[PDB]
Amino acid sequence: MYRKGAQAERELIKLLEKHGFAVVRSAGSKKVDLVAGNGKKYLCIEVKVTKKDHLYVGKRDMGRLIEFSRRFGGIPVLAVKFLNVGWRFIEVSPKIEKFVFTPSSGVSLEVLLGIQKTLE
Amino acid sequence: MYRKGAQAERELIKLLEKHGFAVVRSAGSKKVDLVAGNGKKYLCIEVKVTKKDHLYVGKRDMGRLIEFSRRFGGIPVLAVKFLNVGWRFIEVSPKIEKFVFTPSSGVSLEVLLG
């Protein structure tokens, strides 16, 4: 099994739960890796981890995530752990095509959730 | 031990998809078996299977489903597949249960989905 991937996933789940989200892992990553809901927001997440300072995401993978997210009713999210740098989240746009993401390309979990613009 | 259950889960996933829901099967089924969404209705499902014409459903078991569905933001659903007869569904309530489920209990999938 992809051990490094499983380790990153475990870390991410706890982060999500810390923010009040109930998380479910999709068996075999069928359509997506994880689905998380906190009562008002639903996230459909694809998890990636790399030691490189950039990451390429195929058009197919992007399409699978956007498609499932739209049907399910959740925000399509690409969660990447840039080793030696940290987690970066990108709420992917409807555009289904290739794309290269860098740490400067994503936001923190707090911003992804919009904590920075919520009084409480 | 888990064969009839694994099979039931796969079949229910198809039924839901046929109705427009995107479904994910929980790995290990720690809290629930399936989570489905179609954009308006969200479901957190505990799937049970039995060869008998009745099934005992405990309060604790349902308490876990309800708590997870409450946190997640989905409808806590109990799906029971009575072998050789059919599926019956019921939205579980926080109020304890510890009741017996039969092929005449709850509602049909179509009515559950309104």
Side-chain angles (χ1 to χ4, degrees), chain A residues 1-8:
Chain A
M1 180 194 270
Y2 183 23
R3 304 292 173 175
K4 249 60 269 294
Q7 182 176 58

Side-chain angles (χ1 to χ4, degrees), chain A residues 89-106:
Chain A
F89 302 88
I90 171 53
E91 176 171 349
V92 296
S93 60
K95 304 82 164 182
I96 301 176
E97 190 59 63
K98 290 288 180 294
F99 207 114
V100 173
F101 305 78
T102 62
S104 298
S105 308

Side-chain angles (χ1 to χ4, degrees), chain B:
Chain B
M1 172 178 283
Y2 305 104
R3 291 177 286 272
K4 68 176 65 66
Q7 183 181 317
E9 287 174 42
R10 279 177 283 159
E11 307 174 325
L12 183 54
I13 288 168
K14 298 292 179 51
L15 280 44
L16 292 165
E17 283 171 349
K18 186 179 74 294
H19 283 65
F21 281 82
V23 191
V24 292
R25 180 161 61 76
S26 170
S29 297
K30 298 182 178 300
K31 274 57 174 55
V32 305
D33 297 307
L34 313 175
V35 172
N38 74 341
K40 182 173 182 59
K41 164 115 62 188
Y42 294 94
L43 316 172
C44 296
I45 310 168
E46 174 64 12
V47 177
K48 305 296 188 185
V49 186
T50 185
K51 301 186 300 179
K52 301 164 65 180
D53 55 22
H54 61 289
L55 181 70
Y56 288 103
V57 186
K59 57 180 179 299
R60 180 174 180 176
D61 186 21
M62 294 305 91
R64 183 194 61 265
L65 172 62
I66 292 172
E67 177 50 39
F68 178 92
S69 302
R70 188 210 69 182
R71 284 176 57 67
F72 188 90
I75 299 166
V77 180
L78 172 63
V80 180
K81 181 190 177 186
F82 292 93
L83 294 169
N84 294 160
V85 31
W87 289 91
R88 297 300 291 182
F89 306 81
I90 189 177
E91 169 175 350
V92 68
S93 296
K95 57 181 180 180
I96 65 175
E97 299 297 303
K98 201 69 181 65
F99 65 112
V100 186
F101 207 72
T102 59
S104 81
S105 297
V107 302
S108 65
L109 177 60
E110 186 163 43
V111 41
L112 170 71
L113 299 184

